[PDB]
Structures are given as C-alpha cells and as structure tokens.
Write a protein that binds this DNA or RNA. Structure first.
Ligand SMILES: Cc1cn([C@H]2C[C@H](O)[C@@H](COP(=O)(O)OP(=O)(O)OP(=O)(O)O)O2)c(=O)[nH]c1=O
Ligand SMILES: [Ca+2]
Ligand SMILES: [Ca+2]
Ligand SMILES: [Ca+2]
Length: 439
DNA sequence: GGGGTGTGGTAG
DNA sequence: ATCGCTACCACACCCC
C-alpha cells in the first residue's frame, strides 16, 4: 500500500492524502464555481452601496466533521469532553484540526502530535481521528447551499472549504440595528447547524472586512460577534494578538515586536505606533494596511474582492508543489517525475482552455549540514530553495515544449538527484484561447 | 515613465 | 511512519 516517489502512482496517492492539496483544490473549485455562476450576472458591490459583512467560518472544521463521521472504533469519543485531533500519524504528524477541548491545553492546528501529547496532564488521553475528505466536501456543500437558500446576502464570496464572506447591502431607507443583525447571525448559525447535521459556525459581523475577521475570532467557538466601526473600544483591541490582524504572520509579528517593544495586544500596538515607524518596520504597503486596520478600515487591495470579485477570483497561475516523499536516486527518475508533473498540470491547463507563456521550476535541496533523513518521516527537512523561470515566447500547451524546458530548468539549478527534497512546477502566465487561431 | 528577475511572506 | 499545497501580493534589485 506504499507508493514511492518514483512510482507512477505517487502524485495521485500523495494528493489523495494531503490536506494542503485538498485545501488548495477545494478553493480553486469554489473560485471556478463562482465565476461560472456569474458569467452573465453582474453581482458586485458598487460605490453607491452601503454594506454589512457577515464573515462565517466552521469551528474546528476537520475535527468537527471527522468526529460527526467517526467510525465505530471511536463511538464512545465525546466531542465536548475529550481532546480530539485529526491527523495521519502518531509522532511527527501534523494536527490538521483540533477541537476546543484540546485547545484549552494549548494545542494548536499545525502542531505535531508528539508536541501536543506533552501538553496533556497525566491521565488525559489525546484522541486521534482519521481524515474524512469526502465528507469535509459534503459538509461544505451543505454550508454553501444553506447560505444561498437563506436569501439574505447580495454577494457570497468563497474564502475556503469552510469559510465565506457574505455581503448584505442596506438600502438608505432601511434602519439597520444590532437586533436585526443578531437575529440574522442566529438564523445563519441554526440553519447551518441543521443543514450540516451538527457542525457549528461562528460569525463576525461588521461594516469592514477587517473588523468582520476580528469579530469572527472574538466570536469563536460557536458564537457570533457584532462590532461596527462605531462600536470600537479599548476593550475590543485589547482582546487580540498582533498576528490576529490579516496579513500579519510570524515574520511580521517578529518585526513588530522588535520595533515597538513587544506589544502584547492590538491595543498595545495601536497606542505605540506611528505610521512612518510602522512602514519602516514591516514595509510600506503592509504598514499602511495595518495602520488602516487599527482604525477598523480596509485597504484598497482588500476592497477589490467586493468591487470586482470576478477579476480577484480569476486564476492567473497554475502550479504543483511536492515537498514530501521526495527521494530520488538518479536523474532519470527525476526527469520522469517532472514529466508526470507536467502531464498533470497540462490536464489542468486544458480544462480551463488556456496556454502558458512563462514557466518556473523551484526545488528544495538538503542543506549541506542537514541529516539525509530528517526528523519527519519522508520530510524535506532543512533545505535551501532554488528557483528559475523561462519565457516560452509562443504561448503553448504542448507537452514536448514545456516538459523539455522544465527538465532544462532543473539542469540549470545543479541539484544532485540524491540531494533533492522538493519540487515545484509552475505555469506563471496564462493566455486565453479564442475562436480565432489562424496564426 | 516602462520592463524584467528571484525571493519573502501570508492565507486558507 | 506519514502525506510539509498553492495562489498571489509585495519587495529589492537589475534593464531601458
Ligand atoms: C489553515 C489550515 C487549515 N487546514 C484545514 C483544517 C481545518 O480544519 C480547515 C479550516 O481551517 P481553519 O479555519 O484555519 O481552522 P479550523 O476550522 O480547524 O479551526 P478554527 O475554529 O480556529 O477555524 O482547513 C489545513 O489542513 N491546513 C491549514 O494550514
Ligand atoms: Ca474554521
Ligand atoms: Ca477557514
Ligand atoms: Ca494574521
């Protein structure tokens, strides 16, 4: 039942098991579905519209669904009392999702099982459930079907398998109130709970995208929060960590902590920062984004999804990344893998009826001082990254052209096959295919 | 002013 | 064991 990377079935088996592959494939499908359902519609927010954002997201999605769908081997498992994770393995295996019991011990999505087990007091046992990928998708379908059926939103924007941004336009003749917004939140939560046979969503409700995201975090688990710009307070900002802000990850977090004397909440940050010191710390565009976010306001870039969702959701690149299980003995096997990847990508490219004029090969190579077999079974371990791109000239979907150039790109980066630990193949620029192809 | 490249980072 | 994907914005540093 084990498929090595030189086996023709490797890509199929890896993608079938990989949560992150599913995460990307689901999002791509939701994007395509939105564009197809709106090819002739012109559903979009205009400058004349005043809107409310309902940002809706499943609580511990994989853990909830895997629990509801668990096999009889786990019948006695208790979602409200047991710490529950979803993962493949037993040690250096990622926790895809953990329930809020597990989180009360400090366990987080993305931790290794080995790390999470150590956070449990003696006598407390971690419950590890398998993935149920098809049921994740079915629950998502129920989610999106329910959102449409409620007929309360002018625009429903897919964010992910378990998350959507739902926009309600308020006519100027209508007096919106907290009570009406609360009743809509409760309707949404109950209808999704029924429609999904027991999954919970939380909801952030506001007059900006960024505040609706923060409200969502405040609402979790299994709740809703309504915080409009009018309602902003010190109590609100004091409730969030710095990387609760959209666009702030670990690297930006570290830079903000170094620049502003280790702020411990968004309130700390907003009382200490200056716009200029903030652009200097994290960059001009991200600095302006954060500055606006601390006023509860969206930046120009984030607003594009409301005003032109078709262009924001339109796919502009196509790629695969395989950075697990990569163990090749020679260049012949590397070349065959590149060919299989190009075949896979060209199927995707032909499905969307496009050609490509620029491609990229990226690789991960074992660091010179890193063990040949890393801590994580079949992991890439510590690696150096290399990337090179090539303009094709004539846009094409021809395997011969693209695969030959990808294999040449690999040659130019000089990685010995045995040192290779990861490969990415990218079609960076896509070109339409029209009815007129006479030259 | 226009173009290019590889790399960093974040989102889900 | 264990499945560490993928799209896209932003940036620094080059060309004219
Ligand atoms: C962010 C992320 C999510 N996922 C999957 C598992 C998650 O259950 C699902 C949705 O992601 P999230 O919404 O980020 O997480 P969650 O729903 O488990 O927990 P929360 O209550 O805090 O929202 O997507 C991954 O597999 N890898 C990831 O990096
Ligand atoms: Ca979620
Ligand atoms: Ca989500
Ligand atoms: Ca963030």
């Amino acid at each position: 039942r084990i498929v090595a990377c030189d086996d023709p079935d490797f890509l199929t088996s890896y993608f079938a098991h990989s949560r992150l592959h599913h995460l990307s494939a689901w999002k791509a499908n939701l994007k395509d579905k939105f564009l197809n359902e709106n090819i002739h519609k012109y559903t979009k927010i205009t400058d004349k519209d005043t809107y409310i954002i309902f940002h809706i997201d499943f609580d511990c999605f994989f853990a909830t669904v895997a629990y509801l769908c668990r096999s009889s081997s786990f019948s006695a498992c208790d979602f409200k009392r047991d710490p529950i994770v979803v993962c493949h393995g037993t040690k250096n295996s990622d926790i895809a999702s953990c329930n809020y019991v597990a989180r009360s011990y400090g366990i987080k999505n993305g931790m290794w099982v080995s790390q999470a087990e150590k956070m449990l007091p003696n006598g407390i046992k971690l419950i590890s459930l398998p993935y149920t990928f098809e049921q994740f998708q079915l629950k998502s379908e129920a989610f999106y079907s329910t959102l449409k059926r409620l007929n309360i939103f002018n625009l429903i924007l897919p964010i992910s398998i378990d998350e959507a941004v739902c926009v309600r336009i308020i006519p100027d003749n209508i007096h919106n109130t907290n009570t009406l917004n609360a009743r809509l939140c409760e309707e949404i939560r109950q209808e999704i709970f029924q429609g999904t046979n027991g999954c919970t969503v939380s909801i952030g409700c506001s007059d900006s995208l960024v505040l609706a995201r923060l409200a969502l975090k405040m609402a979790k688990p299994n709740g809703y929060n309504i915080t409009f710009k009018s309602n902003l307070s010190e109590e609100f900002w004091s409730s969030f960590k710095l990387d609760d802000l959209p666009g702030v990850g670990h690297s930006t977090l570290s830079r903000l902590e170094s620049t502003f004397d280790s702020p411990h909440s968004l309130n700390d940050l907003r009382k200490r920062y200056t716009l200029d010191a903030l652009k200097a710390s994290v960059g001009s565009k991200l600095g302006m984004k954060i500055h606006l976010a601390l006023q509860g306001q969206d930046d120009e870039e984030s607003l594009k999804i409301l005003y032109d969702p078709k262009e924001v959701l339109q796919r502009k690149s196509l790629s695969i990344d395989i950075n697990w299980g990569i163990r090749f003995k020679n260049i012949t096997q590397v070349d065959l893998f590149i060919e299989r990847g190009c075949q896979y990508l060209l199927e995707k490219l032909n499905e969307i009826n496009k050609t490509t004029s620029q491609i990229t090969l990226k690789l991960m190579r074992r660091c010179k001082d890193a063990p040949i077999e890393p801590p994580k079974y079949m992991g890439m371990g510590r690696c150096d990254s290399f990337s090179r791109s090539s303009r094709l000239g004539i846009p094409t979907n021809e395997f011969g052209i693209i695969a030959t150039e990808m294999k040449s790109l690999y040659r130019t980066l000089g990685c010995p096959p045995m040192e290779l630990r990861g490969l990415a193949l990218q079609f960076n620029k896509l070109v339409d295919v029209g009815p007129d192809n006479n030259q």
